[PDB]
Amino acid sequence: DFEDSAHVPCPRGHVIAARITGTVQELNFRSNKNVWGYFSVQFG
Amino acid sequence: PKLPELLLKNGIAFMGPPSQAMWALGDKIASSIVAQTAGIPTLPWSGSGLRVDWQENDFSKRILNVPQELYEKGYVKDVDDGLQAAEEVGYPVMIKASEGGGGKGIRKVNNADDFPNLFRQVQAEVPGSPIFVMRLAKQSRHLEVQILADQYGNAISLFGRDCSVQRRHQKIIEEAPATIATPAVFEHMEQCAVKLAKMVGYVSAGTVEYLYSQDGSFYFLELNPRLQVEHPCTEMVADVNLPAAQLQIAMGIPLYRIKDIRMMYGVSPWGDSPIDFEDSAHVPCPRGHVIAARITGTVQELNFRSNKNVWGYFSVQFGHCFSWGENREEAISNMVVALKELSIRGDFRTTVEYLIKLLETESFQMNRIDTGWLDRLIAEKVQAERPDTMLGVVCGALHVADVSLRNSVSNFLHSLERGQVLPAHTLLNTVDVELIYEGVKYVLKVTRQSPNSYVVIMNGSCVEVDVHRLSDGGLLLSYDGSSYTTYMKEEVDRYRITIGNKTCVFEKENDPSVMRSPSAGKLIQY
Amino acid sequence: VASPAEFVTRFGGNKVIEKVLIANNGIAAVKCMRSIRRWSYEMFRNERAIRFVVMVTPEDLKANAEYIKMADHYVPVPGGPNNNNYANVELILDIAKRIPVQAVWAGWGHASEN
Amino acid sequence: SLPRIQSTALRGEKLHRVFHYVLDNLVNVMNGYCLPDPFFSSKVKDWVERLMKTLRDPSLPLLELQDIMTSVSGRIPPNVEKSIKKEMAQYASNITSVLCQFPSQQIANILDSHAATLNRKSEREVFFMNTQSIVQLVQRYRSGIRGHMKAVVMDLLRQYLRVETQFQNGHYDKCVFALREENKSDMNTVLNYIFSHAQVTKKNLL
Numbered sequence: 001d002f003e004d005s006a007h008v009p010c011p012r013g014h015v016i017a018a019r020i021t022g023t024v025q026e027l028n029f030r031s032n033k034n035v036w037g038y039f040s041v042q043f044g
Numbered sequence: 045p046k047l048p049e050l051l052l053k054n055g056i057a058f059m060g061p062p063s064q065a066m067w068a069l070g071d072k073i074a075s076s077i078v079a080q081t082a083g084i085p086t087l088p089w090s091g092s093g094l095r096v097d098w099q100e101n102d103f104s105k106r107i108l109n110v111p112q113e114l115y116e117k118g119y120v121k122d123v124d125d126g127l128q129a130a131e132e133v134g135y136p137v138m139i140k141a142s143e144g145g146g147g148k149g150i151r152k153v154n155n156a157d158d159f160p161n162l163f164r165q166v167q168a169e170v171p172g173s174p175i176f177v178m179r180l181a182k183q184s185r186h187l188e189v190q191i192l193a194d195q196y197g198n199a200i201s202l203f204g205r206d207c208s209v210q211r212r213h214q215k216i217i218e219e220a221p222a223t224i225a226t227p228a229v230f231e232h233m234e235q236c237a238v239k240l241a242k243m244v245g246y247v248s249a250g251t252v253e254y255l256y257s258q259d260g261s262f263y264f265l266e267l268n269p270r271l272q273v274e275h276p277c278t279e280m281v282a283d284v285n286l287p288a289a290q291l292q293i294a295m296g297i298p299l300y301r302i303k304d305i306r307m308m309y310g311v312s313p314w315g316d317s318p319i320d321f322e323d324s325a326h327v328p329c330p331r332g333h334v335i336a337a338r339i340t341g342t343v344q345e346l347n348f349r350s351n352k353n354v355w356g357y358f359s360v361q362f363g364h365c366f367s368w369g370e371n372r373e374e375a376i377s378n379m380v381v382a383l384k385e386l387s388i389r390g391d392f393r394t395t396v397e398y399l400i401k402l403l404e405t406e407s408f409q410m411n412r413i414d415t416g417w418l419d420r421l422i423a424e425k426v427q428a429e430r431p432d433t434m435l436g437v438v439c440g441a442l443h444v445a446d447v448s449l450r451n452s453v454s455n456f457l458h459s460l461e462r463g464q465v466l467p468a469h470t471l472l473n474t475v476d477v478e479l480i481y482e483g484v485k486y487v488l489k490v491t492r493q494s495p496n497s498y499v500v501i502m503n504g505s506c507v508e509v510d511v512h513r514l515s516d517g518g519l520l521l522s523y524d525g526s527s528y529t530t531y532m533k534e535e536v537d538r539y540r541i542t543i544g545n546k547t548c549v550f551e552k553e554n555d556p557s558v559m560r561s562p563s564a565g566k567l568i569q570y
Numbered sequence: 571v572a573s574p575a576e577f578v579t580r581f582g583g584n585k586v587i588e589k590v591l592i593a594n595n596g597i598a599a600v601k602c603m604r605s606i607r608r609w610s611y612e613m614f615r616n617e618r619a620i621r622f623v624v625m626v627t628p629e630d631l632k633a634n635a636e637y638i639k640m641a642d643h644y645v646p647v648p649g650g651p652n653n654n655n656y657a658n659v660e661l662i663l664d665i666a667k668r669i670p671v672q673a674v675w676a677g678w679g680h681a682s683e684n
Numbered sequence: 685s686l687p688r689i690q691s692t693a694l695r696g697e698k699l700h701r702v703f704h705y706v707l708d709n710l711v712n713v714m715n716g717y718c719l720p721d722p723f724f725s726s727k728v729k730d731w732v733e734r735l736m737k738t739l740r741d742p743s744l745p746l747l748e749l750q751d752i753m754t755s756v757s758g759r760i761p762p763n764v765e766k767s768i769k770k771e772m773a774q775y776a777s778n779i780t781s782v783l784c785q786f787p788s789q790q791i792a793n794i795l796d797s798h799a800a801t802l803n804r805k806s807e808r809e810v811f812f813m814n815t816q817s818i819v820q821l822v823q824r825y826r827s828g829i830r831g832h833m834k835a836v837v838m839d840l841l842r843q844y845l846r847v848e849t850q851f852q853n854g855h856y857d858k859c860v861f862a863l864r865e866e867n868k869s870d871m872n873t874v875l876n877y878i879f880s881h882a883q884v885t886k887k888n889l890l
Contacts, residue, residue: 653758654755657757658754658755659754659757661751661755664698668698
């Protein structure tokens with residue numbers, strides 16, 4: 001019953017997403033293991 | 045240990061323990077003697093009776109007033125004293141030269157009858173050196189405890205690492221949370237580790253290693269008085285910038301003033317209140333599970349798009365990958381995905397195939413491994429995860445084909461632009477492949493069928509394929525079933541084929557019996 | 571568990587889906603592949619249980635787009651603007667019908683609103 | 685010792701794709717990429733039976749104006765779409781008649797008619813470049829279904845003809861030197877040429 005369990009889910013931390021503009025290189029960032037990203041050829 | 049001596053004499057800080065503790069703890073014999081001096085948290089049999097007077101709550105040191113008669117007893121003056129010691133510890137034992145370095149002067153002894161020749165041999169290997177005897181331990185688990193100490197006597201433990209997975213005594217695979225050990229036993233081991241460290245005055249980061257058995261008996265093996273390569277494991281589970289903390293220790297910053305630790309103990313990010321680590325021993329709890337794996341541009345930190353919470357690196361030599369999960373199963377799954385994509389890279393493919401396999405073994409799945417597990421996993425040359433044979437021969441044959449074709453074409457178009465009226469024949473579609481697998485060769489022909497289509501001819505058969513040629517030296521093929529991906533590395537006398545995540549290698553050999561001329565013309569003489 | 575069909579039966583589903591056509595490209599298709607292969611290994615310990623067919627233009631082929639090589643199967647399609655390939659609903663249907671496949675994932679854009 | 689099962693993706697069922705596929709393969713036959721043996725030298729003949737049947741088969745115009753009119757759902761003036769779609773529909777009704785002709789000329793007149801009334805001032809040959817495939821389609825399609833059986837093979841004929849006429853005039857070497865000077869700047873056409881008459885006997889029989 002999602003109404004009775006409306007309060008159960010809570011976000012885990014915070015996330016920031018940023019649009020960036022081989023040929024498609026998914027670019028992993030070493031600054032954080034909990035941070036990752038990608039770029040395609042156009043945007044990522 | 046001379047390093048901290050020289051920088052300290054010159055007023056230059058060192059991101060590590062000071063000189064006295066580094067020498068008194070870095071020498072293996074002396075460190076084993078200190079361990080014996082403390083409350084001996086189950087030291088091996090050979091060092092049961094060995095001990096020293098009380099090193100107490102203030103500064104402690106080596107003193108050799110008493111540990112010289114006892115010490116020379118560890119340095120068993122003759123075969124008779126060795127045989128009696130061997131009887132006390134109980135067979136099997138190890139005769140080890142105390143001045144032996146890099147594995148010289150070590151012999152395994154199963155019985156008193158075997159003992160004498162190995163004893164004379166160890167003497168001959170390191171003549172003049174005293175010799176000691178130590179217990180060849182039983183099959184156990186190799187575990188590590190992470191330690192951190194300041195300049196005022198506050199030193200704490202965080203958690204451990206499981207390093208049972210070893211190859212030729214080298215730690216190959218690590219895991220952070222050693223859930224196998226009992227929480228109470230781990231707490232006792234941590235307190236013992238803290239006692240020994242505080243007793244000697246450690247003032248940096250350190251790792252205390254213990255040997256644990258399924259029985260529930262454990263024995264201390266050694267202390268690494270320095271940082272290890274796998275410490276980032278702790279950084280990822282603790283949310284602690286470890287080198288910055290090490291620097292702060294070198295700056296005299298108290299433990300209670302590190303933000304990360306404050307949060308760890310659920311206190312104010314900016315308060316200055318001193319923390320009783322004993323009273324707050326229970327506050328920290330591990331977050332999930334971590335698996336670390338030792339792997340063998342020039343240094344590519346390796347992590348892709350297939351999985352979050354998993355990362356890794358490779359340097360040129362070795363690297364490490366770390367996979368986090370909410371629990372063991374989730375972390376293994378994530379690890380698998382990382383190894384299949386990373387496995388597609390080249391020089392470390394077959395070895396890593398056996399690694400993926402080992403990771404998939406039921407013993408591993410059940411956490412039913414030990415230090416000798418692996419030792420029995422090798423001598424098992426278990427080749428598997430291996431492509432379809434005939435696909436192998438195929439992508440081979442047409443790899444050689446394509447390359448030769450590129451050469452013949454590039455030579456024709458270079459040369460023809462450059463002005464030679466060449467004879468027609470060389471323009472051939474006609475490919476003759478001779479490829480020796482396990483004594484057998486597969487002899488095939490390949491005829492170019494269309495700028496994008498190749499036809500493979502097996503022993504009087506006809507299969508028609510197309511490829512749509514790639515850019516940087518790869519060839520993928522598509523059928524009813526699906527599309528596959530191949531890369532080709534060539535050697536002098538081996539043919540080194542990659543079919544997706546799979547590698548296979550073939551030899552060409554006709555030399556030792558046939559004399560092949562490499563050029564045409566007349567035979568003048570013999 | 572032995573198979574996707576068994577998953578459907580054991581868990582009370584009603585449609586056996588073994589093959590999905592991604593009617594998109596780029597990150598949508600790639601993210602879908604990575605996520606699905608992780609789930610497929612988790613459920614059946616075989617990442618290739620659901621094969622994926624992609625449409626490949628000469629431009630994409632010359633660019634050597636990694637999703638092409640990541641994909642399990644490719645079909646060369648006519649080049650140019652997305653309106654002649656990605657948006658030809660009838661052509662897409664024809665391919666789905668021709669293999670045949672059991673599902674389509676479109677992701678976002680190019681034909682997301684027809 | 686091989687799986688013939690996955691070697692099935694040779695035919696299709698769409699005659700439109702049978703056309704493009706088989707045609708590209710054959711122009712590749714006569715580009716020089718011929719096959720060294722009888723198997724092959726038989727198989728393509730069969731392929732041409734598949735051709736002949738599909739070459740008489742009046743489903744070509746339907747499958748190609750289907751496929752283009754599927755690819756131009758947008759950019760569309762609905763007057764012209766409902767006109768074309770009605771009257772294709774009764775080409776469809778009148779197919780399999782002894783007295784069936786293409787509605788091509790009718791389409792040319794209507795399309796030329798609202799080209800006559802000029803969606804103007806911005807988009808004259810915008811519209812032309814949206815309805816391009818059709819004016820060349822109708823241009824193959826004026827002389828009928830054997831408009832095609834004439835035209836295509838006639839082209840192939842001049843392909844063979846041109847290549848092998850430059851090929852033989854003097855003797856092989858000098859002729860290749862005449863090739864050097866006919867196209868002094870580039871030789872890729874020359875290499876494809878050399879390749880083609882290299883597998884002449886396959887070409888020649890065929």
